Amino acid sequence: GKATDRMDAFRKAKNRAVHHLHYIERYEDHTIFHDISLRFKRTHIKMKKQPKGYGLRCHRAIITICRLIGIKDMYAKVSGSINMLS
Amino acid sequence: PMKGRFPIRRTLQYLSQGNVVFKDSVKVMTVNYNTHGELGEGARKFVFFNIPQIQYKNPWVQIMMFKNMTPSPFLRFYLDSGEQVLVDVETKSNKEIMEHIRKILGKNEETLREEEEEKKQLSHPANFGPRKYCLRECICEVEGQVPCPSLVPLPKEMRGKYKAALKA
Amino acid sequence: KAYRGGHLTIRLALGGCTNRPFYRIVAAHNKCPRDGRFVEQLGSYDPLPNSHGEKLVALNLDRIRHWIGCGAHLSKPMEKLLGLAGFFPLHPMMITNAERLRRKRAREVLLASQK
Amino acid sequence: VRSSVHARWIVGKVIGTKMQKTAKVRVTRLVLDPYLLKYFNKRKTYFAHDALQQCTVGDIVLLRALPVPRAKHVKHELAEIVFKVGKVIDPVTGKPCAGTTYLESPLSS
Amino acid sequence: ETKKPTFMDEEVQSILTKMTGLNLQKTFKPAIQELKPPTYKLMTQAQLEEATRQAVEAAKVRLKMPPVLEERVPINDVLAEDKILEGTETTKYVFTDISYSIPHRERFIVVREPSGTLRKASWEERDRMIQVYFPKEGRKILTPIIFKEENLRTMYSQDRHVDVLNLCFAQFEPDSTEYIKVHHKTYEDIDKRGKYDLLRSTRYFGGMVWYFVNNKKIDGLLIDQIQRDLIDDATNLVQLYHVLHPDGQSAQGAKDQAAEGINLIKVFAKTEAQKGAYIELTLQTYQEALSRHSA
RNA sequence: AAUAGGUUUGGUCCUAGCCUUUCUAUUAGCUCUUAGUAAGAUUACACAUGCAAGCAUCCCCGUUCCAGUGAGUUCACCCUCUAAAUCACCACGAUCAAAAGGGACAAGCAUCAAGCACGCAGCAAUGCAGCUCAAAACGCUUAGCCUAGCCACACCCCCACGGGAAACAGCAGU
Ligand code: FES
Ligand SMILES: [Mg+2]
Ligand SMILES: [Mg+2]
Ligand SMILES: [Mg+2]
Ligand SMILES: [Mg+2]
Ligand SMILES: [Mg+2]
Ligand SMILES: [Mg+2]
Ligand SMILES: [Mg+2]
């Protein structure tokens, strides 16, 4: 959400996100199904499926997104350009 | 990622996965193979895959490769007594070559187990010393015994600072 | 470290902390440091009584026999430990100290009775 | 059988014949790189006492350790010429070969 | 002439294994320990069957029954009486042979008492010293306070009999007085509370069955087996009881009447079962259920 | 360098450096109640003083050890051979371990690229002209190490007859 006022940007972004919902498949409703190593543009994301109780040992943004998704246990290393949007 | 093709070959797990440990007789192994031709394919794979593992399990056995020196690929083992062993590896697969050399010149499981037991006898549980060599450093780590003074101060009657004061 | 002369000896290398003695029975050069390098550790000895009121002694008898056969000497404390264990005859000094203690206690008893 | 030489049997390639009754041989051993975990050829130069001066530069020769070194650098002796240069006899078949082709067919006998 | 069977006999082992049963879910119940990400394999039906068979073999290895040993005879042996050393040392010495290639029951552990008596170490001292110098995972030098009566009762209230048995097996030797006492107390609590299903698919079922058979109190186990439709196990239990008590009323009745299968149970219920009427009622209820299922 | 973070710009993306966050060690500032344990000159610069090697029926043995320091530095590890030492005495051997021989063995610098005799054969006379090296020879600088401990040094001249000179890198201390 991009706006002149911060509150307007918050409202725009949060109202427009719900029209762009992904459904994230989870394994046993606590983790991802397999290790996912990908590169988006200049950012490498390497995610490891972990057993229960391992927790979210991920980048802070990834911790937030995983809490939103409903992923409890996962490891994640971000390499290359640490760009929030990428 | 890890460079090259089949980068698993450059991992300690793959190197330790070898099963061929040559007897003390074997000193040199000359691997003659051809870089082209269907019949030598297995031999090529044997050089590409199994040669590192062998050399890892046998750090002192010399291994020397030769390319396109003979029309057929073969291995020649030189033993410490002067005996030479010729293994014709044509039309065979690399797994077959590994099994054959393990059978004819590789130590069996029993010998490896005996060596491992002789190594294990070197580490005695009852020995006390540094963690590098012994499970425990001091007898104070054993429950029931008098604990370390650094953790539990000793009674004044068990410390010489007060024994000398009482005697004097 | 090559030493001039010397010989293997079975002895007690002192360990533990201050006021907490704990000996390790080891085979080592007599010229080597007391707590320094040792050829082989042959056991342990905790002089301080534990909760059960015991002084634990551990003796690798097989290796002790091997080293004595190999020519290793013995220190007096180690000889007394083995004599107490029954592995050797009681050391003459153990018996003599026992007799001296008996004489001393008898003299104390006689003095107390005379008082 | 007891010898004061470390390497008893070594297979190498002759790289020099300019010394009397001595062949300069290059012996290559696979050595693991601790970091890359890849085996590379590490080569060392040995002197082999060639009594008959039969060694030719470029042939593969097997060297046996002498019981004692006979010189400052000579510790090995030419036990066998495994692969004569340009005159390789295929050990599997016993027929002469030039590279990967038989100069004489194995079916000849 | 005619020797009564022992625990480790082939027929007894087969009967006890059959009565124990195998339950891969229970035997390989997920362990609360440091976990790792599980590995996934793609298998056909044949590969899955072979993997299940290997798991069954591993479970059978895991369920190998510990041997039942008689209580060890106390050690009272004096190797020497050196009266000269009497009163010299205020504390007794314990000498332990720590040679590596010696069985732990053949190690010489001796004690020099303050009275100068060099005596072979008692069983408790032997176990203590072996643990001190050859430590074993799961064993404690000092007896854990879990084996006190109150804590055993607390564990029993939570139905942790198998955990108690594992702790007892780790801490105590199979012939130990404490091991025997704790095992017998666990079996008695199970019999009193009818918790025979806790020890099923475990290696302690054979010991429990043997203990019940030797003391003629297999009434509750038989009742539970009948209730759970394990009539094959009940018949094998009756046969084992008859074999281990040939000169009994039940065995004589079975011999004279040539009873087999369910009748055997009836014979026992009529002859030696203290809860004979209850066993007859339960068997009649099971037979009524069988008749209803048939029709 | 990581679960990463701040920082280039009017702004964005990428690359990149720098710094922050964590854990130790030393010193400094401010402050500090007790008990136990562990550890404890910056300096291979010079040392006052006191002690640190005696024992024992005389011969012998020990003072070559322990203790110390890190100056120097691929004498440490493996194999072969075999001294001295222990097993009273031979052990017709075991253990331990010198010298000798073979192999392996730190970092930086290639603006250190040539070393200059560094090889071989012969019983010898002597003959051949070779040997090492960009897969790092030769050289310079730095550094005790691979820590149950090991190597080196013991005021300097690498050594120590000799010379310089009169020695705490033994303990306490200056
Ligand atoms: S380290 Fe054992 S008493 Fe302190
Ligand atoms: Mg310095
Ligand atoms: Mg310049
Ligand atoms: Mg220095
Ligand atoms: Mg000085
Ligand atoms: Mg000097
Ligand atoms: Mg000083
Ligand atoms: Mg000062």
Short mmCIF file of N, CA and C in Angstrom, two decimals, chain B residues 34-135:
data_model
loop_
_atom_site.label_atom_id
_atom_site.label_comp_id
_atom_site.label_asym_id
_atom_site.label_seq_id
_atom_site.Cartn_x
_atom_site.Cartn_y
_atom_site.Cartn_z
N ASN B 34 40.05 -47.07 -20.75
CA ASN B 34 39.85 -46.32 -21.97
C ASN B 34 38.75 -45.29 -21.77
N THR B 35 38.95 -44.10 -22.33
CA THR B 35 38.01 -43.01 -22.17
C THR B 35 36.82 -43.12 -23.10
N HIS B 36 36.83 -44.07 -24.04
CA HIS B 36 35.71 -44.26 -24.94
C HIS B 36 35.58 -45.74 -25.26
N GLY B 37 34.38 -46.14 -25.66
CA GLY B 37 34.08 -47.55 -25.89
C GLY B 37 33.09 -48.00 -24.84
N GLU B 38 32.06 -48.71 -25.29
CA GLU B 38 31.01 -49.15 -24.37
C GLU B 38 31.56 -50.09 -23.31
N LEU B 39 32.43 -51.02 -23.71
CA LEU B 39 32.88 -52.07 -22.81
C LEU B 39 33.64 -51.53 -21.60
N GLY B 40 34.35 -50.42 -21.76
CA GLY B 40 35.05 -49.82 -20.65
C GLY B 40 34.22 -48.90 -19.79
N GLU B 41 32.93 -48.73 -20.11
CA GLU B 41 32.10 -47.76 -19.41
C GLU B 41 32.16 -47.97 -17.90
N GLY B 42 31.92 -49.20 -17.45
CA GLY B 42 31.98 -49.47 -16.02
C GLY B 42 33.31 -49.06 -15.42
N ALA B 43 34.40 -49.43 -16.09
CA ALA B 43 35.72 -49.04 -15.61
C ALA B 43 35.81 -47.53 -15.47
N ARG B 44 35.31 -46.79 -16.46
CA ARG B 44 35.29 -45.34 -16.37
C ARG B 44 34.55 -44.90 -15.12
N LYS B 45 33.35 -45.45 -14.91
CA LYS B 45 32.59 -45.11 -13.71
C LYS B 45 33.37 -45.48 -12.47
N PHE B 46 34.09 -46.60 -12.52
CA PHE B 46 34.89 -47.02 -11.37
C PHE B 46 35.94 -45.97 -11.05
N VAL B 47 36.52 -45.34 -12.07
CA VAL B 47 37.45 -44.24 -11.84
C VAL B 47 36.70 -43.02 -11.33
N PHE B 48 35.51 -42.77 -11.88
CA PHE B 48 34.79 -41.54 -11.56
C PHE B 48 34.22 -41.58 -10.15
N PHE B 49 33.79 -42.76 -9.69
CA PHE B 49 33.05 -42.88 -8.44
C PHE B 49 33.85 -43.59 -7.35
N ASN B 50 34.33 -44.80 -7.62
CA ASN B 50 34.84 -45.67 -6.57
C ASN B 50 36.31 -45.45 -6.24
N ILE B 51 37.09 -44.89 -7.16
CA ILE B 51 38.51 -44.67 -6.89
C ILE B 51 38.73 -43.76 -5.68
N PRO B 52 38.03 -42.63 -5.53
CA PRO B 52 38.22 -41.85 -4.29
C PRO B 52 37.94 -42.64 -3.03
N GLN B 53 36.78 -43.29 -2.95
CA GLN B 53 36.42 -44.04 -1.75
C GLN B 53 37.53 -45.02 -1.37
N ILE B 54 38.01 -45.80 -2.33
CA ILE B 54 39.09 -46.74 -2.06
C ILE B 54 40.28 -46.01 -1.45
N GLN B 55 40.72 -44.93 -2.10
CA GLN B 55 41.88 -44.22 -1.61
C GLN B 55 41.61 -43.61 -0.25
N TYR B 56 40.34 -43.29 0.03
CA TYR B 56 40.01 -42.80 1.36
C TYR B 56 40.12 -43.91 2.39
N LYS B 57 39.64 -45.11 2.06
CA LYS B 57 39.72 -46.22 3.00
C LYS B 57 41.13 -46.78 3.09
N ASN B 58 41.97 -46.48 2.11
CA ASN B 58 43.32 -47.03 1.98
C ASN B 58 44.28 -45.89 1.71
N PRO B 59 44.57 -45.06 2.71
CA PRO B 59 45.33 -43.83 2.45
C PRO B 59 46.76 -44.07 1.99
N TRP B 60 47.33 -45.25 2.22
CA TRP B 60 48.73 -45.49 1.88
C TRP B 60 48.91 -46.27 0.59
N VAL B 61 47.86 -46.92 0.09
CA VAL B 61 47.96 -47.66 -1.16
C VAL B 61 48.01 -46.67 -2.32
N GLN B 62 49.10 -46.70 -3.07
CA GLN B 62 49.22 -45.84 -4.24
C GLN B 62 48.21 -46.26 -5.30
N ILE B 63 47.59 -45.27 -5.94
CA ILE B 63 46.67 -45.50 -7.04
C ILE B 63 47.14 -44.66 -8.22
N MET B 64 47.34 -45.30 -9.37
CA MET B 64 47.84 -44.59 -10.54
C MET B 64 47.00 -44.96 -11.75
N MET B 65 46.46 -43.95 -12.42
CA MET B 65 45.56 -44.16 -13.54
C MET B 65 46.29 -44.01 -14.87
N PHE B 66 45.80 -44.73 -15.87
CA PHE B 66 46.33 -44.66 -17.22
C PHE B 66 45.18 -44.68 -18.21
N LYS B 67 45.25 -43.81 -19.20
CA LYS B 67 44.19 -43.61 -20.17
C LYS B 67 44.64 -44.08 -21.54
N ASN B 68 43.85 -44.95 -22.16
CA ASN B 68 44.03 -45.36 -23.55
C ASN B 68 45.44 -45.89 -23.80
N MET B 69 45.94 -46.69 -22.87
CA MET B 69 47.23 -47.35 -23.05
C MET B 69 47.11 -48.76 -23.60
N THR B 70 46.01 -49.45 -23.32
CA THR B 70 45.73 -50.79 -23.79
C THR B 70 44.33 -50.83 -24.38
N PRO B 71 44.07 -51.75 -25.31
CA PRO B 71 42.73 -51.81 -25.92
C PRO B 71 41.64 -52.17 -24.93
N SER B 72 41.97 -52.75 -23.79
CA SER B 72 40.98 -53.16 -22.81
C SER B 72 41.31 -52.59 -21.45
N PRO B 73 40.30 -52.24 -20.66
CA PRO B 73 40.56 -51.74 -19.31
C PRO B 73 40.81 -52.86 -18.32
N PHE B 74 41.76 -52.66 -17.40
CA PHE B 74 42.08 -53.66 -16.40
C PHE B 74 42.70 -52.97 -15.19
N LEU B 75 42.68 -53.67 -14.06
CA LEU B 75 43.39 -53.24 -12.87
C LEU B 75 44.55 -54.18 -12.59
N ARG B 76 45.64 -53.63 -12.08
CA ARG B 76 46.79 -54.42 -11.69
C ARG B 76 47.21 -54.01 -10.29
N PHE B 77 47.15 -54.96 -9.36
CA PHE B 77 47.55 -54.74 -7.98
C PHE B 77 48.93 -55.32 -7.77
N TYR B 78 49.82 -54.52 -7.18
CA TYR B 78 51.16 -54.98 -6.83
C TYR B 78 51.21 -55.22 -5.33
N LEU B 79 51.58 -56.43 -4.94
CA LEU B 79 51.60 -56.80 -3.54
C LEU B 79 53.01 -56.65 -2.98
N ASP B 80 53.09 -56.62 -1.65
CA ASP B 80 54.37 -56.39 -0.98
C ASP B 80 55.35 -57.54 -1.20
N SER B 81 54.85 -58.73 -1.55
CA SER B 81 55.73 -59.87 -1.80
C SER B 81 56.24 -59.92 -3.23
N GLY B 82 55.83 -58.99 -4.08
CA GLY B 82 56.18 -59.00 -5.48
C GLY B 82 55.13 -59.60 -6.39
N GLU B 83 54.14 -60.28 -5.82
CA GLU B 83 53.07 -60.85 -6.62
C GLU B 83 52.23 -59.75 -7.25
N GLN B 84 51.76 -60.01 -8.47
CA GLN B 84 50.90 -59.09 -9.20
C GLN B 84 49.57 -59.75 -9.49
N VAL B 85 48.49 -59.00 -9.31
CA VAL B 85 47.13 -59.48 -9.52
C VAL B 85 46.53 -58.69 -10.66
N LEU B 86 46.09 -59.40 -11.70
CA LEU B 86 45.48 -58.77 -12.87
C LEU B 86 43.98 -59.04 -12.85
N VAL B 87 43.19 -57.98 -12.86
CA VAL B 87 41.73 -58.06 -12.83
C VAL B 87 41.23 -57.44 -14.12
N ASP B 88 40.70 -58.27 -15.02
CA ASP B 88 40.13 -57.79 -16.27
C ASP B 88 38.74 -57.24 -15.99
N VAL B 89 38.58 -55.93 -16.13
CA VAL B 89 37.34 -55.27 -15.76
C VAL B 89 36.50 -54.91 -16.99
N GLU B 90 36.77 -55.55 -18.12
CA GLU B 90 36.00 -55.28 -19.33
C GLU B 90 34.64 -55.96 -19.25
N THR B 91 33.61 -55.24 -19.69
CA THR B 91 32.21 -55.65 -19.76
C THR B 91 31.58 -55.66 -18.36
N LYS B 92 32.36 -55.44 -17.30
CA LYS B 92 31.82 -55.40 -15.95
C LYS B 92 31.35 -54.00 -15.60
N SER B 93 30.50 -53.92 -14.57
CA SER B 93 30.09 -52.65 -14.01
C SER B 93 31.01 -52.27 -12.85
N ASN B 94 30.96 -51.00 -12.45
CA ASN B 94 31.82 -50.54 -11.37
C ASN B 94 31.46 -51.20 -10.05
N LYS B 95 30.17 -51.47 -9.82
CA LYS B 95 29.78 -52.22 -8.63
C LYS B 95 30.37 -53.63 -8.65
N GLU B 96 30.34 -54.28 -9.81
CA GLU B 96 30.93 -55.61 -9.93
C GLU B 96 32.43 -55.56 -9.69
N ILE B 97 33.10 -54.52 -10.20
CA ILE B 97 34.54 -54.38 -9.99
C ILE B 97 34.84 -54.21 -8.51
N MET B 98 34.06 -53.37 -7.83
CA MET B 98 34.26 -53.16 -6.40
C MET B 98 34.06 -54.45 -5.62
N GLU B 99 33.01 -55.21 -5.95
CA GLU B 99 32.77 -56.47 -5.27
C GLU B 99 33.90 -57.46 -5.52
N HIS B 100 34.38 -57.53 -6.76
CA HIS B 100 35.45 -58.47 -7.10
C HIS B 100 36.73 -58.14 -6.34
N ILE B 101 37.12 -56.86 -6.34
CA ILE B 101 38.35 -56.49 -5.65
C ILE B 101 38.20 -56.64 -4.15
N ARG B 102 37.00 -56.38 -3.61
CA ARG B 102 36.77 -56.60 -2.19
C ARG B 102 36.90 -58.08 -1.84
N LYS B 103 36.40 -58.96 -2.70
CA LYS B 103 36.50 -60.39 -2.44
C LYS B 103 37.95 -60.85 -2.50
N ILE B 104 38.69 -60.44 -3.54
CA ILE B 104 40.00 -61.03 -3.77
C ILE B 104 41.13 -60.35 -3.01
N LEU B 105 40.97 -59.08 -2.63
CA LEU B 105 42.04 -58.37 -1.94
C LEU B 105 41.55 -57.47 -0.81
N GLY B 106 40.25 -57.46 -0.52
CA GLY B 106 39.71 -56.60 0.52
C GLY B 106 39.55 -57.35 1.83
N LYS B 107 39.80 -56.64 2.93
CA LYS B 107 39.61 -57.23 4.24
C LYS B 107 38.14 -57.54 4.47
N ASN B 108 37.88 -58.71 5.05
CA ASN B 108 36.52 -59.12 5.34
C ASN B 108 36.00 -58.41 6.58
N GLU B 109 34.69 -58.55 6.81
CA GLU B 109 34.06 -57.86 7.93
C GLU B 109 34.65 -58.30 9.26
N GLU B 110 35.04 -59.57 9.37
CA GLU B 110 35.57 -60.07 10.63
C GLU B 110 36.87 -59.36 11.01
N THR B 111 37.76 -59.17 10.04
CA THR B 111 39.02 -58.49 10.32
C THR B 111 38.79 -57.04 10.74
N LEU B 112 37.86 -56.36 10.07
CA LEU B 112 37.53 -54.99 10.44
C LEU B 112 36.96 -54.93 11.85
N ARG B 113 36.09 -55.88 12.20
CA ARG B 113 35.53 -55.92 13.55
C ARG B 113 36.61 -56.16 14.59
N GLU B 114 37.55 -57.06 14.29
CA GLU B 114 38.64 -57.31 15.23
C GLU B 114 39.50 -56.06 15.42
N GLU B 115 39.80 -55.35 14.32
CA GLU B 115 40.56 -54.12 14.43
C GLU B 115 39.82 -53.08 15.26
N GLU B 116 38.51 -52.95 15.04
CA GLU B 116 37.72 -51.98 15.79
C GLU B 116 37.67 -52.34 17.27
N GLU B 117 37.58 -53.63 17.59
CA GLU B 117 37.60 -54.04 18.99
C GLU B 117 38.95 -53.78 19.64
N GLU B 118 40.04 -54.03 18.90
CA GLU B 118 41.36 -53.72 19.43
C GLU B 118 41.53 -52.22 19.66
N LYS B 119 40.93 -51.39 18.80
CA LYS B 119 40.95 -49.95 19.03
C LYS B 119 40.11 -49.58 20.25
N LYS B 120 38.93 -50.19 20.38
CA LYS B 120 38.04 -49.88 21.49
C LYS B 120 38.65 -50.25 22.83
N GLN B 121 39.45 -51.32 22.87
CA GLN B 121 40.11 -51.70 24.11
C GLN B 121 41.08 -50.63 24.61
N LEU B 122 41.51 -49.71 23.75
CA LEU B 122 42.43 -48.66 24.17
C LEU B 122 41.75 -47.66 25.10
N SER B 123 40.45 -47.42 24.93
CA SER B 123 39.71 -46.47 25.74
C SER B 123 39.06 -47.23 26.90
N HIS B 124 39.56 -47.01 28.10
CA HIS B 124 39.04 -47.70 29.28
C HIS B 124 38.06 -46.81 30.02
N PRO B 125 36.84 -47.28 30.29
CA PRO B 125 35.88 -46.45 31.03
C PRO B 125 36.37 -46.04 32.41
N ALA B 126 37.11 -46.91 33.09
CA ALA B 126 37.55 -46.62 34.45
C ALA B 126 38.69 -45.63 34.50
N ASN B 127 39.29 -45.28 33.37
CA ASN B 127 40.39 -44.32 33.36
C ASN B 127 39.87 -42.91 33.58
N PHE B 128 40.62 -42.13 34.35
CA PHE B 128 40.29 -40.74 34.64
C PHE B 128 41.33 -39.83 34.01
N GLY B 129 40.87 -38.85 33.24
CA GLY B 129 41.75 -37.93 32.57
C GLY B 129 41.00 -36.89 31.78
N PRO B 130 41.69 -36.22 30.86
CA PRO B 130 41.03 -35.19 30.05
C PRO B 130 39.91 -35.76 29.21
N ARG B 131 38.92 -34.91 28.91
CA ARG B 131 37.76 -35.35 28.13
C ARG B 131 38.16 -35.87 26.76
N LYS B 132 39.32 -35.44 26.25
CA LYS B 132 39.78 -35.93 24.96
C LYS B 132 40.06 -37.43 25.00
N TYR B 133 40.49 -37.95 26.14
CA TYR B 133 40.85 -39.35 26.27
C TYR B 133 39.95 -40.15 27.20
N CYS B 134 39.43 -39.54 28.26
CA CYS B 134 38.70 -40.28 29.29
C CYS B 134 37.31 -39.68 29.48
N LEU B 135 36.37 -40.54 29.88
CA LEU B 135 34.99 -40.11 30.07
C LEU B 135 34.88 -39.08 31.19
#
